[model samples]
Target: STDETPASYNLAVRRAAPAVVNVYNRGLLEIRTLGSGVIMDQRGYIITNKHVINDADQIIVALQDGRVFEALLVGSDSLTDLAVLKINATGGLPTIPINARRVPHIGDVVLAIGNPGQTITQGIISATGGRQNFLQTDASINHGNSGGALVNSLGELMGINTLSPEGIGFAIPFQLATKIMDKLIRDGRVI
Candidate 1:
């Protein structure tokens, strides 16, 4: 171990990875779409992309620890392309580590966790996307990696990963995502 790298993101992975779940759109008993989801709280409320579950006949969430459950679509915000799903489980669930007080800055180390390989990809924030308002990074967001977790080097959630062109990616800031989720939960829709 002496010759090994001194720093690693293993700690961050442990703190945030469990909360990332695989989303399946089972339409007519077929898996038409696959995406990643982030469990935001103990209430079993999961956040994902709106398009991932759209027209889905049945939505299923699979946790990392071999647990699965049917999820109810709580709401969706088309403008933000974000959606929320709720599940009822007797056991406690792992929620993504978050701190709304801290703002993600450009050049900060970040990890994109999702089900693409059910893995984590490391990168740094390329842009804060201030005017556009999406956190831009060089993290690898694969085809099915949409709706994944974007956590900082300390495992604190910075944003929710969204689909984008290769070599670059974007995420909806955690603050905005949380606000939208709150509104969706309260009104069942963000108008």
Candidate 2:
């Protein structure tokens, strides 16, 4: 019976964690801010919340294996509070699977992956398609969870974790994320 049980997020984590990065923004090496981001493409594109690295003098991205790289600001959209950064890495970038039709329903299971106080926690989807098509989940997300992946049971990226509302967290639906990704890759900005 256990063998027939559905697959868990372990596979997703193993696949996606390589692309998820720990982001740090520094000001003259005096003050530093920490957050999380997801790699958007193999060309070193990373996606994070705008507020995470806002007004910082330098951005540093740390890989899962503890390798750090300097990231350049590519573009940002204040409306959605999403920002894009780029690095010069040549290889070893993980790709995110996009699920176009697998919308999260209320009470559907989901997982949020990020560094929360330097640790990771997993939970379930509490609500689906809130304002702006946000999938609300009860994943134990903290400030660092912004710009992390909200994956479904199938290990596909369903949303980008944005904010937590009370006991529930919200994510940007993949549909909007695709549009933003397209604009960023094409014109380097989203109008």
Candidate 3:
């Protein structure tokens, strides 16, 4: 018997999964790196943690649709632990809507779309307004979930899931993300 849950896994995946991306970096001597990222805009801007692709000679991005492309490091800010990567893709880049003006509440139904241990998982917002109003969730964020998208029920981006203590996850608020992204696109760096 299939129960019809209003907010469930299927809905979350259908709405938010497309925006998530897998990031990989290739460096000298066959060194390679892998992680997750989220699409931030319609102009092909992708967001990931700064440490994920730090000091890599080459970058590659893989979408959910099995498409992979070379990416350029647009900018990075270690203070915020955020970085922007650019790729030349024609279409289908999922741009999650962001609410940069207001803070999302705790217990809000949220989705985390990323390659967590090479798998995707989604869950609710467990806490909010921690140190920097970071959204907290129990969405099983693992080694690969650093740069994944932390989106709301409507598939709007609320934060970027960052590291926290065990059984908890934190995210960089949308407001801060927008400022960093803007600077990355315009200045190629965050000053």
Candidate 4:
């Protein structure tokens, strides 16, 4: 049990995991569906799947370090299957590492970080989708994986993981997700 420098993606996980949070879709008397979310910025703004929070009476976000907050739905775009939420916190929050300059390659190793507290799944870029420009991967994008972060080996965000109709794993490219997030934050909807 003793390799000093074990080859692992723990570093990448360390850098990216804190930004992924568990999102609880709640109702008046019950907890509804569940999904994941990524903190996009230190301002407490988050990005997740639109369907995750659709028609929810209350939304709750639980951070990695045992902190919880009531999240407000900033906006949602059905076309992109993306939604933005905001939480007011007293202290600073962790944000996913984003580099718009870094373009994703087809063979890059990626990690999907998502809800139920914290879970990481590894995979590589399998293909790029057509109309929405999605980053398709073989990773396990289960129901709870929606709205999670897909990061590269360097811990930079590649996209936001979402469900695939064909039982595959797909993510909305970070660039497009960023644009949608910006629009949602500003106009309260994508323009």
Candidate 5:
């Protein structure tokens, strides 16, 4: 389906990536680099998977504009596998927060974006709600894509990519993630 004219989703992705920002990760002991994350706040609250920074002795994040920052572990939830990070931003970092409150209808078009650069995947919302209250999709999920963003047609974040194995994609629904996010932002822990 190649055409001379550009696709609309491409435009939406272009719009989303810059504001949303890119995430970079690594482990200090020659463990190699790995990651992706979303902007939770302009002041530097970032949403990413705990495992991405779990084994790392140092974690560094950079913006698409080439600005880099040393990150701080603001909060982490092992039960949910999510973590919130902080950076010493000057309080004006442009944030690309998305609305993910709406539930995903079966067959909804979902997009997955991950890696520090650009890695986009498209698929349908195959199912919703299983043992873990996750939105199941057919999107291609990868290792470094753990904390990637799963967005809707409007480029709104539907959820955070959690796993893809035995050829299935799963995400922690925004409804649940946000509730935990609230506690992490306030108490810096969900307990």
Candidate 6:
């Protein structure tokens, strides 16, 4: 611990949280599921998962500052289980970009930021494919944490939390996510 202040992971949360968001999918009967996402652009574009908004008849997004918006699906892909959505934000929306150039080491501090409002889960890279495009971590993930951001100490997205197999969570590397997101944004669907 520092002489004056306790060690904290709060800065990572604080630095990254504004860019993380809560996602919702309203079904035919108005049933809903809470999901998570990270903003990709100031134009209010968001990146989440295909399963999250798959059968959703309606969608809504909530920011940390209490602003909310109705979002529209821009595109989706089952190959990567990723989706892209957009909200009509005037400007100044917080965003987290995927910087894939850096590789994460095992035991490197990692945080999984979940939503329905954000909940912080701390851990480290349990396993990673690095350039191969998958990230595995021990950070706890719940049912609705499906689309959350799995970020590194640098505050860049290391991956997007996707599945949890017996508590071992899976994530799509930013390198891969950024690529898929590019296709989603440009073509409205991945080929």
**Distance from true location, Cα of 138 in model 4, Å:** 0.9
Candidate lDDT scores, in order, read 0.88, 0.73, 0.76, 0.88, 0.73, 0.81
Q: Model 4, range 103-188, lDDT digits (tens) per residue? A: 88998999999976478899999985433668899888877678999998999999999875564699999999888889888899
Stretches of candidate 6 off by over 4 Å are 1-3, 27-31, 97-100, 130-133
TM-scores vs. true structure, each candidate: 0.92, 0.83, 0.85, 0.93, 0.84, 0.89
Error of 6 at 49 (Å): 1.3
Q: Which candidate, 2 or 6, has the higher lDDT?
A: 6
Worst 10 residues of 4 by lDDT: 126-135
| CA lDDT for candidate 2 | 0.73
Residue-level lDDT of model 6, residues 51-141, one tens digit each, is 8788777898888888888899999978788999999876688888466568778888888887864688888998875235578888886
In candidate 2, what are the lDDT values of residues 1-51, reduced to their tens digit?
Answer: 867976566776776666677888777647465688888777888888888
Per-model C-alpha RMSD: 2.0, 3.2, 2.8, 1.8, 3.0, 2.5
Candidate 6 — worst ten consecutive residues by lDDT sum?
127-136
Better of 1 and 3 by lDDT: 1
Candidate with better TM-score, 1 vs 3: 1
Candidate 4 clashes between residue pairs 3 or more apart in a chain or in different chains: none
Q: List ranges where model 4 is wrong by over 4 Å.
A: 1-3, 129-131, 165-167
Q: Assess the local accuracy of residue 103 in candidate 6 as a C-alpha lDDT between 0 and 100.
A: 77
**Candidate 1 lDDT over residue span 69-99, tens digit each:** 9999999998888999999965789999999
User: Roughly what TM-score does model 5 have, to 2 decimal places?
Assistant: 0.84
Q: Candidate 5 residues 67-133, lDDT tens each? A: 8787888888887788888888775675654675465789888888776456888897888753266
